[PDB]
Design a protein around this ligand. Structure first.
Ligand code: 6PM
Ligand code: NA
Ligand code: NA
Length: 219
């Protein structure tokens, strides 16, 4: 039967233009703001994402929580030739939607979709997906997983000095354990990007946390 995620994809395929990532973003934002609410980063936070991507021009990006592919389209469209997005999506049907979304956008060659749980896939990146270290991580999956997966990324050797973590929804509904950790730790240099959720009429924010390297042992 029909699902909201199938409806988002159908709306894009009807109204956007194939090979035009920007029209795809605009169709999804129009849909989610005019037709039917959906978990969506939205254009305002999307601008912040764009600016981070443009500032750091990452060659290898890991996304946690693709959902329908909005953020994957958002980020992958700004990646250079040879740059890669790896995106993880725990739900098989959403992973399928994300693939079709990216196919329509013409971005399928820049993205690898991994269908599984973050804590299961993250430790396979080095072996199976030929990853050394990540240049950027976008966290937008389950909120209680931001802190443990960040710790996991670190202990797996996937962060290097200068790796940018960018996490959504750290205020609403909030990830206070993640924030307390990264802001307090000398291993992360943190900044906060406030953005309004107009539909909920509440301020939310993204946290940017730049990995500084592991903590030094006592002398
Ligand atoms: C109501 O159930 C859900 C609510 C939101 C989602 C988002 C789209 C999501 C979360 C993840 C995910 C979770 N882990 C531990 N690792 C990964 C990868 N992938 N995508 C999925 C299910
Ligand atoms: Na989000
Ligand atoms: Na810090």
């Amino acid at each position: 039967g029909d699902t909201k995620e199938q409806r988002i994809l159908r709306y894009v395929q009807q109204n956007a233009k194939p090979g035009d990532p920007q029209s795809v973003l605009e169709a999804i934002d129009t849909y989610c703001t005019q037709k039917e609410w959906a978990m969506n980063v939205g254009d305002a936070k999307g601008q912040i994402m764009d600016a981070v991507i443009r500032e750091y021009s990452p060659s290898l990006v890991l996304e946690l929580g693709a959902y329908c592919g909005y953020s994957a389209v958002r980020m992958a469209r700004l990646l250079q030739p040879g740059a890669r997005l790896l995106t993880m999506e725990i739900n098989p049907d959403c992973a399928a939607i994300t693939q079709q979304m990216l196919n329509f956008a013409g971005l399928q060659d820049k993205v690898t979709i991994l269908n599984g749980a973050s804590q299961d896939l993250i430790p396979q990146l080095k072996k199976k997906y030929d990853v050394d270290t990540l240049d950027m991580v976008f966290l937008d999956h389950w909120k209680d997983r931001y802190l443990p997966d960040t710790l996991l990324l670190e202990e797996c050797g996937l962060l290097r000095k200068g790796t940018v973590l960018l996490a959504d929804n750290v205020i609403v509904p909030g990830t206070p354990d993640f924030l307390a950790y990264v802001r307090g730790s000398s291993s992360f240099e943190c900044t906060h990007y406030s953005s309004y959720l107009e539909y909920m009429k509440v301020v939310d924010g993204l946290e940017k946390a730049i990995y500084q390297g592991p903590s030094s042992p006592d002398k």
